[PDB]
RNA sequence: GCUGACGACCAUAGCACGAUGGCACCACCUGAUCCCUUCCCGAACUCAGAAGUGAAACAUCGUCGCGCCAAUGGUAGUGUGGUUUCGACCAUGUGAGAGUAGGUCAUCGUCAGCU
RNA sequence: CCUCCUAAAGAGUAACGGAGGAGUACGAAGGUGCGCUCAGAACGGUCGGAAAUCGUUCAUAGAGUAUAAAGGCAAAAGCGCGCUUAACUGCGAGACCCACAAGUCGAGCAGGUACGAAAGUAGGUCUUAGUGAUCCGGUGGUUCUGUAUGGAAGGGCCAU
RNA sequence: CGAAAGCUAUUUAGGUAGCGCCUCGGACGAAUACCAUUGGGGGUAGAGCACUGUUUCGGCUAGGGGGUCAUACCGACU
């Protein structure tokens, strides 16, 4: 369950996830990545569900990179609470994802077992992902 | 060097009795006696040691 | 800081008014302030306000 | 150090040009003492007097007496330039000795500041 | 100041050839000598420090200056600008008489003396030693003494390297090793 | 209020506006006494013909045309009143 | 030709490294009587000076190692009109930042001095 | 009431929106003249260390600025010293801001000074919070009035 | 001809008052608007880590995590 160790401020403005991932859109660490074709919020429970699934497939034979860290707290108002009276408490941490961003990379593993592990990770993710090979340019 | 804020700084004759070597240097120490040097009589401060006087068994069976 | 009256010593009755700490300045304060009644700088002596 | 000397000259230098007046800038060294008058703009020299002048080059320069001669000499040159009201610039040097002696000679011999 | 006359007479020359300098103005020389007697026990008894100031006056021959704390330290019970040490800077003829006194009269009077390590140079040709008992100097007397105290002696030279610094100090007969 | 995680966080106060900023922009005619910049600190510095108040306010010392330039060794923003 | 003063400009001007300069000028430099200095110190300031030296500093020259500057093209954004699945797209007008090719060891003004 | 964001690159702009401060302090912590430069790191050094004091080399502020934050600050607005009272009086061209009532900045002029050798600088403090109208009552001044007249009481004006 | 449902203040919040907006009359007359060219300051969109934080991987190590005799100076090596 990724989360920043300490933050400057407890709460954040909603914001507006728009645009393309012109940064963090190329396979930089691994030899094999899984990037996103759609945008959205990638919560920290989806980080650890897709990360646990890839670890069980590589079986201490590869290296996994997580190019996505949740550092944006999402407040939520509990049930039976009127509007106003402040801003709700923080309940979870998302990472803003844009079309193009890789979420995970692999290295050191048969290209068939790497595709088979990134396929299993996309199943736990809220994104339409795709499979991308690391290139020169 | 300001005036009348510093201690008395007068000539004193340091004499190492061991090697009988003298040392003319100005200082503050108030010597009890005053001997006569080549120039005149300076406050004599006797000195004991100076730079000129400071520096198996089983075979006997 | 209590309020005090700085009263000229020229007997013209003109005065200034200021504050003072009566723990770091327990004695009366005196200063050369301008007196418009005689258009002259004279000593002003602290008085109760 | 010249860097420190010019660091403590900048306050007066910048206040002189705000006043928009001609300034009498002085520069002394262990051998010579210089005195030149700069325009309110600050990029034109209109009158100078140094110990490199032939009248008092071959003499005892680097002296309080030589500083008086330079101050006396620039006041004449400034007088025959249209300049009568300058603002003295000690250029970081303490207003004392050679710099002071130059200033009194200039201040007494026609320049008024 | 026999060392002032003796340095400009033959020490300045012999150092140049011994170190192979090409410029006489490049030879090292001693610039200042600073005596530090930092007393951390002050501001709590106010008797130690005046006795230190009295000690330095006799030793150095100049009125010392009382150095105040630059920063507040709760561990040492030290607040802003409390007097926690005295210091004196010696220059010109005043340093050379002191250095002569320290070389010939003061250092031999150090109990259990073996020589000063030459690795106590800071790397820029500057030497610093430490005297544990201030009674070594004949200026201070054993009879009417307050208490045994120490003092720092820092020698500032015009050298740029450790090798030049130790060569300069060896010229005066400094007790190395 | 199930999960009971809400609660008062009292930070609902603010200060009044100060109406700072550039009052007369470059190339404009100006008369002496006219305020040019109201600011905190010297975001802009007083050049020739411009005075500086205790508030750091920059005002025209004389009539002319206000001009902005970045001058000096500190690359500071200066405001000047050119006699034009 | 070089040196100094004061400016313009404020890194394409800076940093770093190396080399050159002592006839003038500058700088270290000598000394501390004197003016004047130090919460101690002739260090700095100040004075009186010319034995030494260009060692440092300074100035000048050289270079691309750093820094700085910097296109063309493309991309992002965006005013207006339209469309949209609300992500964006079309027309028109604008148009970055980053990065790349590349450039850079500045450039001038007044005055004085040695040549 | 002040500072930041929300606030959409002029101003302004709401929420029981997100974060913090104020209801003071200082006769020096104001003025002026002069002088100075920090935080750190490493090396050397008696007690003495991770860090007291000292010396050396890097060191555009990684410090400080009485007080939160923002914006500033080398000509330092930061840090010392000497002398001081401009923390003046009468004002104020012209502006900012503004429903009003208020609030803010201000060159320049006259008088009296303070510092400086002088040109000069000084109408409080780096700035922005540290505040409360009118009525009424008190106090220091004042020739303005003074119910027949002279006073006085009371009232007015200026200061508090 | 032709609004407003705003700002400020209010024992005010569905009332009211000044300003903003409407109308009528008077004064003034281009001082106004649109567009072209042009002088300005900005810190938003975007962007980016140079500051404040936050974040992942690698290299690299004073501090830390462990194991014989060993207060033997706390030593060899992970």
Short mmCIF file of C-alpha atoms in Angstrom, two decimals, chain A residues 43-127:
data_model
loop_
_atom_site.label_atom_id
_atom_site.label_comp_id
_atom_site.label_asym_id
_atom_site.label_seq_id
_atom_site.Cartn_x
_atom_site.Cartn_y
_atom_site.Cartn_z
CA UNK A 43 -5.50 3.90 -6.32
CA UNK A 44 -2.92 2.36 -4.02
CA UNK A 45 -4.94 -0.85 -3.67
CA UNK A 46 -4.69 -1.41 -7.42
CA UNK A 47 -0.94 -0.82 -7.19
CA UNK A 48 -0.51 -3.71 -4.75
CA UNK A 49 -3.00 -5.99 -6.49
CA UNK A 50 -1.25 -5.66 -9.84
CA UNK A 51 2.15 -5.80 -8.13
CA UNK A 52 1.39 -8.95 -6.14
CA UNK A 53 0.12 -10.64 -9.31
CA UNK A 54 3.30 -9.93 -11.30
CA UNK A 55 5.54 -11.07 -8.44
CA UNK A 56 3.85 -14.48 -8.31
CA UNK A 57 4.49 -14.98 -12.07
CA UNK A 58 8.14 -13.93 -12.20
CA UNK A 59 9.01 -16.12 -9.18
CA UNK A 60 12.28 -14.46 -8.08
CA UNK A 61 13.65 -14.55 -11.61
CA UNK A 62 12.92 -11.04 -12.79
CA UNK A 63 12.80 -7.44 -11.70
CA UNK A 64 9.63 -5.34 -11.50
CA UNK A 65 9.54 -1.55 -11.71
CA UNK A 66 6.53 0.44 -10.55
CA UNK A 67 6.49 3.69 -12.52
CA UNK A 68 3.36 4.90 -10.71
CA UNK A 69 3.27 6.17 -7.13
CA UNK A 70 0.10 7.37 -5.39
CA UNK A 71 0.78 10.79 -3.85
CA UNK A 72 -2.62 12.46 -4.10
CA UNK A 73 -4.99 12.01 -1.13
CA UNK A 74 -8.68 11.55 -1.97
CA UNK A 75 -11.07 12.67 0.74
CA UNK A 76 -14.46 10.99 1.11
CA UNK A 77 -17.48 12.04 3.09
CA UNK A 78 -19.00 9.32 5.29
CA UNK A 79 -22.63 8.31 5.10
CA UNK A 80 -25.35 10.30 6.86
CA UNK A 81 -23.40 13.56 6.59
CA UNK A 82 -24.80 16.75 5.08
CA UNK A 83 -22.92 18.86 2.57
CA UNK A 84 -20.48 21.36 4.00
CA UNK A 85 -19.17 21.31 7.58
CA UNK A 86 -15.68 21.22 6.12
CA UNK A 87 -13.78 18.89 3.86
CA UNK A 88 -13.98 15.15 4.42
CA UNK A 89 -11.13 13.04 5.77
CA UNK A 90 -8.55 11.40 3.56
CA UNK A 91 -9.25 7.74 2.86
CA UNK A 92 -6.88 6.70 0.07
CA UNK A 93 -4.11 7.80 -2.28
CA UNK A 94 -4.47 7.75 -6.06
CA UNK A 95 -1.93 8.43 -8.78
CA UNK A 96 -3.11 10.43 -11.78
CA UNK A 97 -2.70 8.37 -14.95
CA UNK A 98 -2.74 9.74 -18.50
CA UNK A 99 -2.80 7.85 -21.82
CA UNK A 100 0.78 6.76 -22.41
CA UNK A 101 2.10 6.19 -18.89
CA UNK A 102 3.63 2.83 -18.09
CA UNK A 103 2.45 1.35 -14.84
CA UNK A 104 4.89 -1.58 -14.61
CA UNK A 105 8.02 -2.86 -16.33
CA UNK A 106 9.80 -6.22 -16.33
CA UNK A 107 13.31 -7.40 -17.15
CA UNK A 108 15.21 -10.65 -16.98
CA UNK A 109 12.42 -13.01 -17.98
CA UNK A 110 11.14 -14.89 -21.02
CA UNK A 111 9.07 -12.61 -23.23
CA UNK A 112 6.22 -15.14 -22.99
CA UNK A 113 6.17 -15.17 -19.18
CA UNK A 114 6.46 -11.37 -19.11
CA UNK A 115 3.49 -10.91 -21.45
CA UNK A 116 1.60 -13.50 -19.39
CA UNK A 117 2.28 -11.53 -16.20
CA UNK A 118 1.45 -8.07 -17.51
CA UNK A 119 -1.76 -9.51 -18.97
CA UNK A 120 -2.68 -10.72 -15.48
CA UNK A 121 -1.90 -7.30 -14.01
CA UNK A 122 -4.16 -5.38 -16.39
CA UNK A 123 -7.07 -7.50 -15.13
CA UNK A 124 -6.82 -5.78 -11.73
CA UNK A 125 -6.43 -2.32 -13.21
CA UNK A 126 -9.11 0.23 -14.18
CA UNK A 127 -7.31 1.07 -17.43
#
